């Protein structure tokens, strides 16, 4: 790999510099090189990996959405479709890269925190592939996303308190899957509601080092429920 000659610690340091510089493709490349050293990631490093790729793919998703909307408004020349397909292919290549790292290196064994986080990540990037998929593929990707989310859900309910931010973020994203991808708004609404209600019922489990993250997700669950009702 392009990062093969660089020390793991230097790769982590440069990922942090790239985040500060808002160079998220660089940051993702550095974090990929760090993963490929084959050691586990700490919580801080998992956050760098997460932030990097989510920034890269988020810009691709937002571009895809602009072009796809132009494409559909023009169905009421080949250039819009071609350019949309070009962005789509790039997005799928980024999702394939992330899913490959998860399967090749990251998902194992290990923290319950870390196992849940990687399975949630797997669900997310299958979901991003599902946003642009069609046909025989699309059903494959959707079941892949569900299976990853559902395994993460089982572990999280077993091993983490109901305010844990990975637990909450996973439940938030799983409900978005139900609503936006699986077309199961009742499933999405019931998951969002019980997730929020169970966090409030066990509010006392907020952690000193992550309570701002937890309460942010609880509010996002409530915003989705208002949107959906």
């Amino acid at each position: 790999g392009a990062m093969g000659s660089m020390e793991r610690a230097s790769l982590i340091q440069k990922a942090k510099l790239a985040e500060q510089a808002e160079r998220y493709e660089d940051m993702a490349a550095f974090m990929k090189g760090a993963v490929e050293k084959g050691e586990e990631l700490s919580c801080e490093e998992r956050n760098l990996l997460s932030v990097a790729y989510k920034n890269v793919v988020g810009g691709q998703r937002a571009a895809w959405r602009v072009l796809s909307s132009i494409e559909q408004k023009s169905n009421e020349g080949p250039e819009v479709r071609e350019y949309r397909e070009k962005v789509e292919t790039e997005l799928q290549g980024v999702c394939d890269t992330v899913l490959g790292l998860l399967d090749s290196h990251l998902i194992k064994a290990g923290d319950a925190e870390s196992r849940v986080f990687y399975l949630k990540m797997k669900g997310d990037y299958y979901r991003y592939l599902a946003e642009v998929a069609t046909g025989d593929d699309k059903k494959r990707i959707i079941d892949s996303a569900r299976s990853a989310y559902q395994e993460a859900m089982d572990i999280s309910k077993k091993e983490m308190p109901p305010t844990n931010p990975i637990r909450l973020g996973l439940a938030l994203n799983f409900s978005v899957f139900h609503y936006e991808i699986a077309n199961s708004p009742e499933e999405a609404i019931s998951l969002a509601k019980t997730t929020f209600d169970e966090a409030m019922a066990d509010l006392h489990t907020l952690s000193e080092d992550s309570y701002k993250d937890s309460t942010l997700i609880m509010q996002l669950l409530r915003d989705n429920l208002t949107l959906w009702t």
Partner: peptide, 10 residues
């Protein structure tokens, strides 16, 4: 308006 998923922090 689409649903909100987990954001980037820290």
């Amino acid at each position: 308006q689409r649903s909100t998923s987990t954001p980037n922090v820290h």
